[PDB]
Design a protein around this nucleic acid. Structure first.
Ligand code: SAH
Length: 453
RNA sequence: GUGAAAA
């Protein structure tokens, strides 16, 4: 055949990638096609031909999937806000379950462990308690929005679909204030301007709002007036922070934080307890579903009064502090000073005195605790996407903890890590996926591993 | 390197 860019070829979509792209096979090439679902027949325009793969685009739909959601605004697909939004919600859940099974088999060689059907959200919309929104000049106008996938091209948006609608309103109000005061958006190309991002977090139960102005420099022209106006429109704002990021980095936050108004934290609830939450601290973005995730992990772990728990990657302390009053001891490790400081305070708020935190990397803390002779019976881990280090895994396995509950937002690194745990005497017992990120391709899981002897 | 998150 010898396909080239611009050729039009008729293909059937036969699979979805982990990121939600349609898969077609033509002349020994695997083609990836945006906005194309399994069983769809399309005319595909060839965009790019590599050696073993190609990239295509839908030129014309000949037959569409019975599971296609016709109502999705394509802006949400292209901006990567809802990159599975073109699929019906029940089939999103089935896709996520399949991804977990496929990953455990392909990466860990596990085919015989029960993976429960992904726990779905009843109304899987408007759920995020945080927005991290770039501010850029687009056609001469200051705009808030989101990047087109695989780019830094800002697509202006006001309705973000999957955010707390109050957050959407706050972001728009802030955008309009930035225009009114003629504050200059960040320009990555020219390394100029002031306003890089607006971050807004709103407590899922409490409704308390933190605004963060992420800027290139300390001085913001008439920020006091800006703050005055925004708190008038939104009296639930308890905190306006500034974060100063003077580097050319894709990391949203730089090192320097300043309180411009009110508190340096919001308070919200999880599993009936109160948690203070700093701007730079992590907080699960779908509180409703994160509670169910935590409860699954707790249920899996079969906690007893004599248990000694490690809460690794503990953040503001939500997981360990949810169980502290039912176990003997909780030991937590968290890298970010502001977050571990939240956890310390949070223990005190909830009258917990058997929770002990260290500010360190998880692997360092694990080695130190192993040296001190801490005797954990249960290790709970909740790492970022990159997963655990081999040194942490090996160290954790030397404790002889009989139960490990791995909470993961990236099944590829979880499966890799599970494969190492299985080499060190742990057996994967069960896996429960939970839909923390509806409308997106992202899968959250909890896995229970238990020590063979 | 954090729903998107280029070089
Ligand atoms: N190498 C490392 N060691 C310890 N903590 C780390 C780390 N890398 C990232 N972190 C922290 O790991 C956390 C992952 S988010 C999970 C936090 C918490 N368990 C919760 O459910 O809310 C973040 O707080 C992040 O700052």
């Amino acid at each position: 055949m010898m396909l080239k860019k611009n050729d039009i070829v008729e293909v059937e979509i036969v699979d979805l990638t982990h990121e939600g792209a349609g898969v077609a096979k033509v002349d020994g090439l695997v083609f990836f096609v945006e906005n194309a679902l399994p069983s769809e027949k399309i005319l595909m325009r060839v965009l790019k031909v590599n050696k073993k793969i190609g990239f295509g685009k839908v030129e014309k739909y000949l037959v569409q999937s019975p599971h296609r959601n016709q109502d999705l605004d394509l802006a949400y697909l292209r901006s990567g806000i809802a990159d599975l939004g073109h699929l019906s919600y029940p089939e999103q859940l089935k896709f996520k379950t399949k991804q977990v099974k496929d990953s455990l088999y392909k990466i860990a060689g596990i085919a015989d462990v029960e993976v429960a059907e992904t726990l779905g959200m009843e109304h899987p919309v408007k759920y995020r308690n945080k927005a991290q929104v770039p501010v850029r000049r687009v056609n001469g106008v200051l705009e808030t929005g989101f990047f087109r996938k695989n780019s830094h091209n800002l697509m202006p948006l006001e309705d973000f679909f999957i955010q707390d609608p109050v957050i959407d309103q706050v972001v728009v109000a802030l955008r309009d204030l930035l225009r009114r005061f003629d504050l200059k958006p960040y320009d990555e190309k020219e390394q100029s301007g002031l306003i890089r991002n607006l971050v807004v977090r709103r407590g899922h139960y409490s409704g308390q709002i933190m605004v963060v102005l992420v800027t290139t420099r300390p001085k913001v022209f008439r920020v006091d007036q800006l703050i005055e106006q925004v708190i008038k429109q939104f009296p639930e704002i308890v905190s306006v922070m500034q974060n100063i990021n003077d580097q050319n980095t894709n990391a949203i936050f730089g090192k320097e934080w300043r309180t411009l108004y009110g508190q340096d934290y919001i308070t919200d609830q999880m599993l009936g307890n109160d948690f203070q939450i700093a701007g730079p601290a992590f907080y699960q973005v779908n509180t409703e579903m994160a509670e169910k995730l935590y409860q699954t992990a707790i249920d899996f772990a079969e906690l007893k009064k004599d248990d000694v728990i490690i809460d690794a990657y503990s953040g503001i302390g939500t997981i360990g502090l949810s169980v502290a009053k039912h176990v003997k001891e909780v030991y937590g490790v968290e890298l970010i000073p502001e977050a571990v400081e939240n956890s310390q305070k949070n223990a005190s708020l909830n009258k917990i005195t058997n929770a002990h935190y260290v500010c360190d990397t998880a692997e360092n803390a694990m080695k130190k605790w192993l040296k001190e002779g801490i005797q954990p019976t249960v290790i709970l881990v909740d790492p970022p996407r990159k997963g655990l280090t081999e040194s942490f895994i090996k160290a954790s396995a030397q404790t002889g903890a009989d139960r490990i509950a791995y909470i993961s937002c990236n099944v590829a690194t979880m499966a890799r890590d599970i494969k190492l745990y299985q080499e060190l005497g742990y057996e994967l017992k069960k896996v429960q996926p939970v839909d923390l990120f509806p409308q997106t391709h992202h899968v959250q899981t909890v896995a229970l591993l238990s020590k063979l002897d």
